[PDB]
Design an enzyme around this catalytic site. Structure first.
Site, PDB file in Angstrom:
ATOM      1  N   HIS A   1      64.239 -92.384   1.695  1.00 44.42           N
ATOM      2  CA  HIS A   1      64.099 -90.927   1.681  1.00 44.42           C
ATOM      3  C   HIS A   1      65.090 -90.216   0.753  1.00 44.42           C
ATOM      4  O   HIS A   1      65.019 -88.997   0.649  1.00 44.42           O
ATOM      5  CB  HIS A   1      64.119 -90.314   3.086  1.00 44.42           C
ATOM      6  CG  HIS A   1      65.430 -90.378   3.810  1.00 44.42           C
ATOM      7  ND1 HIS A   1      66.545 -89.681   3.367  1.00 44.42           N
ATOM      8  CD2 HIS A   1      65.728 -90.962   4.994  1.00 44.42           C
ATOM      9  CE1 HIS A   1      67.490 -89.910   4.263  1.00 44.42           C
ATOM     10  NE2 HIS A   1      67.043 -90.673   5.262  1.00 44.42           N
TER      11      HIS A   1
ATOM     12  N   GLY B   1      75.134 -86.348   5.915  1.00 44.27           N
ATOM     13  CA  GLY B   1      75.717 -87.222   4.902  1.00 44.27           C
ATOM     14  C   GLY B   1      76.033 -88.628   5.393  1.00 44.27           C
ATOM     15  O   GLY B   1      76.557 -89.445   4.632  1.00 44.27           O
TER      16      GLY B   1
ATOM     17  N   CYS C   1      73.604 -90.787   6.588  1.00 41.61           N
ATOM     18  CA  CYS C   1      72.432 -91.637   6.321  1.00 41.61           C
ATOM     19  C   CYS C   1      72.764 -92.836   5.437  1.00 41.61           C
ATOM     20  O   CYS C   1      73.468 -92.693   4.436  1.00 41.61           O
ATOM     21  CB  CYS C   1      71.272 -90.823   5.758  1.00 41.61           C
ATOM     22  SG  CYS C   1      70.424 -89.793   6.990  1.00 41.61           S
TER      23      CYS C   1
END
Ligand SMILES: [Mg+2]
Ligand SMILES: [Mg+2]
EC number: 3.4.19.12
Lengths: 304, 301
Positions: A41, A143, A145
């Site tokens: 993503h 932040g 991920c």
């Protein structure tokens, strides 16, 4: 003596964390050999997130659209490809700090350490259990991920998890290192909720053994039970059914304390019906299920 | 979202852990530059534990009595001196993995991460607080002496604790990196007792502020209290008294949520009186005192 939620030392994993940027989206990546792994993503924007075509979005993206940062050094992306929900960025240089590793898919009830990162920099480490509903109760801010989950066997790091998203209830969802999600989740910005969580019964038992090893023995009773009798009570209180596999796994703890698993099940059965009645176990007023029998043995029975 | 007790990444500290041996005793050492720091009780035998004369034991030792091992490499000891309860073994090779570091002496209520080691090898990492009675509720087995406590601020590692012993009640005692003990403890096997443990009030208040930031408002009330009335109630529950310093420290969290410190004090007073009533705060059925005001801002912002 003493008992704590202990994470594995994170040093072998710290030397693999990188920052991956694509457009106005920065998240963490895992640099092993000449490949950087991150959630797919990262190629998405606010627009192509409600209904994203990753297959279409990746063919238009080029190598120079990926900014890979290893500390202060910049890494040249010499290729890219997708494997399920993870993006594989081929880079020009191999990570000299690459440890001995393997990609493993864990089962619910198993535990692992999470290295929480922000912009490629490791900031914290904590121990986790994969919930029976396939979510993890972690602590992640924006932040994070691409933060990873791991276990250390001896010298071998086994990567089992990569963070992808947070669910509306505060719980977290992710994939194994091959991009396969844990649970019925999709990497799209849509309304999705986790199933009903259940208590990991075999883990609660391992923790009651750790309590007995540390002097907390008030909940022990003269009684015993059977698997059939215990499971009928357990299912009423939202507890995982106990199998004969679970009984054999508690073996080394049953042998070391002198309390058979079925003997311990009667104490647990009694705690579910009657409650803890003002008392605590290992300084806790709730039954703890995020320690496996192996975690208890590694922390108590053996030095490592 | 989510509130977890987090430890610092242990990587910078792992590269400093060594194994020290004297006679039949093996414990851990901290290798920074050309110095290995370790508990001085490594020079004691069985009959030395009750009343050791460390100055006497040390004068009878030469450099080749200490076996220092960094993994598979043997380190040559070229000097030795004692500083309070810590032994300093001067080695010939400086540690290439020495991080940027400081030695800091912490106060009760402060939190830090512990890298538990056995035979110079890291086994696990956990977060804990220095209790008001100068002990730590850690998790240590035999051979863990020399394991260190630390905080990381940017690239700098602050070493604040070195493990020396377990007390008969199951709690742990140690020194700062200059060898001075936290608390009225000594490195003798004689009967030592830790003072009564109390709840770290400023930390519970910081954790109630984190609960409000994460949405939990069920425990708030329309009352406010004076600092003197709050302390009179809290002393009855074995809670540490709150001082004006604790109030100033909580300022940022008070301004962030819009809830004055003495208004949050009156909510804590009511929680002590009523209990949780089956409810939980940040996934816990007890009031948590091992998160400092600084830790709450660092995790909830
Ligand atoms: Mg029984
Ligand atoms: Mg109030």
């Amino acid at each position: 003596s003493g008992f704590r939620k202990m994470a594995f030392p994170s040093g072998k994993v710290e030397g693999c964390m990188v920052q991956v940027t694509c457009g106005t989206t920065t998240l963490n990546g895992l640099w092993l050999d000449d490949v950087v792994y991150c959630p797919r993503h990262v190629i998405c924007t606010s627009e192509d997130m409600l209904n994203p075509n990753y297959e279409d979005l990746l063919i238009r993206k080029s190598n120079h659209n990926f900014l890979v940062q290893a500390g202060n050094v910049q890494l040249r992306v010499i290729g890219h490809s997708m494997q399920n929900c993870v993006l594989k960025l081929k880079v020009d240089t191999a990570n000299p700090k690459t440890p001995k590793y393997k990609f493993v898919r864990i089962q619910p009830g198993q535990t692992f350490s999470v290295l929480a990162c922000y912009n490629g920099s490791p900031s914290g480490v904590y121990q986790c259990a994969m919930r029976p509903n396939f979510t993890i109760k972690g602590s992640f801010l924006n932040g994070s991920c691409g933060s990873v989950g791991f276990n250390i066997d001896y010298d071998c790091v086994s990567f089992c998890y990569m963070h992808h998203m947070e669910l509306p209830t505060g719980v977290h969802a992710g994939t194994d290192l091959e991009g396969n999600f844990y649970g019925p989740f999709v990497d799209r910005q849509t309304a999705q909720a986790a199933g009903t969580d259940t208590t990991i019964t075999v883990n609660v038992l391992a923790w009651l053994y750790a309590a007995v090893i540390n002097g907390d023995r008030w909940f022990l009773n003269r009684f015993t039970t059977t698997l059939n009798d215990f499971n009928l009570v357990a299912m009423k209180y939202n507890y995982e059914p106990l199998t004969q596999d679970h009984v054999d796994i508690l073996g080394p703890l049953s042998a070391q304390t002198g309390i058979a698993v079925l003997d311990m099940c009667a104490s647990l059965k009694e705690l579910l019906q009657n409650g803890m009645n003002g008392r605590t176990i290992l300084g806790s007023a709730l039954l703890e299920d995020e320690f496996t029998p192996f975690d208890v043995v590694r922390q108590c029975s053996g030095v490592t």
